[PDB]
């Protein structure tokens, strides 16, 4: 097959490197021509940790057959790679001699955090929060329900970037979540909240990861909203056609207090949704947020 194009070409080891493949540090050996897939690579290529010995895992040839990979490397480790003479190519080429190569794997630090700062998008329930983790098996998380009256002030502070700046909210839940990402694999995971009843009550919540551990921490706080009010804003020249509709059945929602707030969370204008769940306002160059509320339910919409 590919053996015909590489016929007459020598087998050369072009490179030895560490690359991030999927979410894990991977050892890559790049060869000049396609390698034979039927050979036992563990018999001809040895990877040995200077202190702990024989590195576990099997070699994986790339689809192009010129790269040989060994995934999920341990960080900050000294490795001896011995490429034996008898490594065979598709065209039957071999090396002239053994090669010995060293590599110190990258010092990648344990890291955990939320996938994002969150969204103002409302939900009827909160099933899970997406998180990401590398060699952080568990995390302690504090959940705060923002006081209904403190919300425009709270959200305006949050949207602009804080120890006592949290008495705008009430602690409603503390839990330890066992992530256990696969060793040396940066994984996308979920904090399951579905069965935590206090996080299923209407409101805007802030989830905060405990700040105790020598980790990167990326996004330690995230925001989520539990609301029945679905808000949509349509812009045409200077007009805002705002529709408030139920997240349960899509029906028009009447009597919803809709406000346009500035960057300080101050009301610029206010109106009530009609029988068709409609609110028509002029655009305000200072409007940063749209706020919709009724009977303890609150939805925010970013106009920026």
UniProtKB/Swiss-Prot annotation:
The compartments listed are:
Cell inner membrane
What protein family does this chain belong to?
A: Belongs to the protease inhibitor I39 (alpha-2-macroglobulin) family. Bacterial alpha-2-macroglobulin subfamily.
Cite the record's note on assembly: May form homooligomers.
Relate the protein's function as given in its record.
Answer: Protects the bacterial cell from host peptidases. Acts by a 'trapping' mechanism. Cleavage of the bait-region domain by host peptidases leads to a global conformational change, which results in entrapment of the host peptidase and activation of the thioester bond that covalently binds the attacking host peptidase. Trapped peptidases are still active except against very large substrates. May protect the entire periplam, including the lipoproteins anchored to the periplasmic side of the outer membrane, against intruding endopeptidases.
Other information: Bacterial alpha-2-macroglobulins were probably acquired one or more times by horizontal gene transfer from metazoan hosts.
What does its UniProt record remark on the domains?
Answer: Cleavage causes major structural rearrangement of more than half the 13-domain structure from a native to a compact induced form.
Q: What is this protein called?
A: Alpha-2-macroglobulin
Q: Which organism is it from?
A: Escherichia coli (strain K12)
Please name the gene that encodes this protein. yfhM
Section covered of the full-length record: 57 to 367 of 1653
């Amino acid at each position: 097959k590919l053996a015909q194009q590489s016929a007459g070409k020598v087998l050369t080891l072009l490179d030895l490197s560490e690359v991030q493949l999927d979410g894990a540090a991977t050892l890559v050996l790049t060869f000049s021509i396609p390698l034979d897939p039927d050979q036992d690579f563990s018999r001809v290529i040895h990877v040995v940790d200077k202190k702990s010995g024989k590195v576990d895992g099997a070699w994986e040839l790339s689809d192009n057959l010129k790269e040989l990979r060994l995934r999920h490397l341990e960080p900050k480790r000294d490795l001896i790679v011995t490429i034996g003479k008898e490594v065979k190519a598709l065209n039957n080429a071999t090396f002239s001699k053994d090669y010995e190569k060293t590599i110190t794997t990258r010092d990648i630090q344990p890291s955990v955090g939320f996938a994002s700062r969150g969204s103002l998008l409302p939900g009827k329930v909160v099933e899970g929060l997406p998180v990401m983790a590398l060699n952080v098996n568990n995390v302690d998380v504090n959940f705060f329900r923002v006081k209904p009256e403190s919300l425009p002030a709270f959200i305006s502070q949050w949207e602009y970037r804080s120890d006592k700046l949290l008495q705008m909210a009430d602690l409603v839940y503390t839990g330890r979540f066992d992530l256990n990402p696969a060793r040396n694999t940066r994984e996308k995971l979920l904090l399951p909240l579905g069965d935590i009843k206090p996080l299923q009550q209407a409101g805007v919540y802030l989830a905060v990861m405990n700040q105790a551990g020598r980790y990167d921490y990326s996004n330690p706080a995230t925001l989520f909203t539990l609301s029945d009010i679905g808000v949509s804003a349509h812009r045409y020249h200077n007009r805002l056609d705002i529709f408030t509709q139920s997240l349960e059945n899509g029906a028009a929602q009447q009597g919803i207090e809709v406000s346009l707030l500035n960057e300080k969370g101050q009301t610029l204008t206010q109106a009530t949704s009609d029988a068709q769940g409609h609110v028509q306002l002029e655009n305000d160059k200072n409007a940063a947020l749209l706020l919709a509320r009724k009977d303890g339910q609150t939805t925010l919409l970013d106009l920026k």
